[PDB]
Scaffold this active site. Structure first.
Site, PDB file in Angstrom:
ATOM      1  N   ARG A  72     -10.692  -5.706   2.575  1.00 33.80           N
ATOM      2  CA  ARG A  72     -10.154  -5.582   1.178  1.00 33.80           C
ATOM      3  C   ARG A  72      -8.592  -5.555   1.183  1.00 33.80           C
ATOM      4  NH1 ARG A  72     -13.703  -7.128   1.596  1.00 33.80           N
ATOM      5  NH2 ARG A  72     -15.692  -7.238   0.602  1.00 33.80           N
ATOM      6  N   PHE A 123      -7.861  -4.686  -4.191  1.00 31.97           N
ATOM      7  CA  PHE A 123      -8.930  -4.663  -5.314  1.00 31.97           C
ATOM      8  C   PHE A 123     -10.150  -5.599  -4.863  1.00 31.97           C
ATOM      9  CE2 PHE A 123      -6.116  -2.675  -8.556  1.00 31.97           C
ATOM     10  CZ  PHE A 123      -7.093  -1.392  -8.592  1.00 31.97           C
ATOM     11  N   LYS A 166      -5.320 -13.614  -0.354  1.00 33.79           N
ATOM     12  CA  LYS A 166      -6.145 -12.682  -1.377  1.00 33.79           C
ATOM     13  C   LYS A 166      -6.563 -13.088  -2.424  1.00 33.79           C
ATOM     14  CE  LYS A 166      -4.304  -8.846  -3.397  1.00 33.79           C
ATOM     15  NZ  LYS A 166      -3.473  -7.280  -3.378  1.00 33.79           N
ATOM     16  N   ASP A 184       1.986   2.637  -4.647  1.00 32.22           N
ATOM     17  CA  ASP A 184       0.688   2.807  -3.858  1.00 32.22           C
ATOM     18  C   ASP A 184       1.600   2.535  -2.351  1.00 32.22           C
ATOM     19  OD1 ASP A 184      -1.946   2.859  -3.394  1.00 32.22           O
ATOM     20  OD2 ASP A 184      -1.961   0.800  -3.742  1.00 32.22           O
TER      21      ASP A 184
END
Length: 272
Positions: free
Chosen positions: A16, A18, A36, A144
């Site tokens: 991963r 999202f 991705k 993040d």
């Protein structure tokens, strides 16, 4: 016909933010990339927000920022059957192939002090700081920032590389709930916040870099207290200046937290 398979040969899955990412080989240029793939939300406002990442990565060129190559969309029939081997819009975004293990893995492999060289720890921090400085200079927020979003190239060059939550600022209301430990107090209680959120998490990382954790239970325990400005004696002692720096970065008042460029300009950063 699916463009992903039309242009790439999947080499292996790699996990991963999202969505999911594969190592894939480009059939024409004959070298390996990280692809991705995001299952896209509905109603074109949630989508536009997911699109932010590609809008930013395409206008970002910095040696501490993951190299972007391409982004496309796919609306396939029965990928569902294809996926279990390995109103249905998918965002494919093609990245530079980095090292398999990120900073979080790098730290887990180094659980005692003697592994975490003071020189190396700062060197890999500064690159993140510089990257954040650039990111901020072009009026953007990462919101993040955690070791598992910091990567290494084959040349051993640290790159921050998951802009799934990147957004812009103004003269520095945004979205509240937006990563567990690393999230700044502003976001936690639900408030108006700034790029200064990135400095908060940046501080936590610097502690993590210098203070080696043994268990996730320990890790959570100490990180929670470091947020509240409680510091292990072993850290307060052998890294006093860093300890001064981190607590500044960790203050509950956003304006008291230094700017990215301030942190880089600190004496602590020396020479190779």
């Amino acid at each position: 016909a699916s463009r992903y398979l039309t242009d790439f040969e999947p080499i292996q899955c790699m996990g991963r933010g999202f969505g999911v990412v594969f190592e894939a080989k480009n059939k024409v240029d004959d070298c390996n990339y990280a692809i991705k793939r995001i299952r896209l939300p509905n109603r074109e406002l949630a989508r536009e927000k997911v699109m932010r990442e590609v809008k930013a990565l395409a206008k970002l060129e910095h040696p501490g920022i993951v190299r972007y190559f391409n982004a496309w969309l796919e609306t396939p029939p029965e990928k569902w059957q294809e996926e279990m081997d390995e109103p249905k819009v998918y965002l494919y975004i093609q990245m530079q192939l980095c090292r398999k293990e990120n900073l979080k893995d790098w730290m887990n492999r180094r659980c005692s002090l003697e592994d975490r060289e003071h020189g190396v720890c700062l060197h890999i921090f500064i690159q993140i700081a510089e990257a954040v400085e650039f990111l901020h200079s072009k009026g953007l927020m990462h919101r993040d920032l955690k070791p598992s979003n910091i990567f290494f190239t084959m040349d051993d060059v640290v790159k921050v590389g998951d802009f799934g939550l990147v957004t812009a600022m103004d003269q520095d209301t945004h979205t509240g709930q937006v990563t567990k430990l690393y999230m700044s107090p502003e976001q936690i209680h639900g408030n108006n916040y700034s790029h200064k959120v990135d400095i908060f998490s940046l501080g936590l990382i610097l502690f993590e870099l210098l203070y080696s954790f043994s268990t996730q239970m320990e890790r959570v325990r100490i990180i929670t207290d470091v947020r509240n400005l409680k510091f292990p004696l072993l850290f307060t002692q052998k890294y006093p200046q860093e300890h001064m720096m981190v607590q500044d970065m960790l203050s509950p008042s956003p304006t008291e937290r230094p700017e990215a460029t301030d942190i880089i300009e600190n004496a602590i950063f020396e020479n190779l």
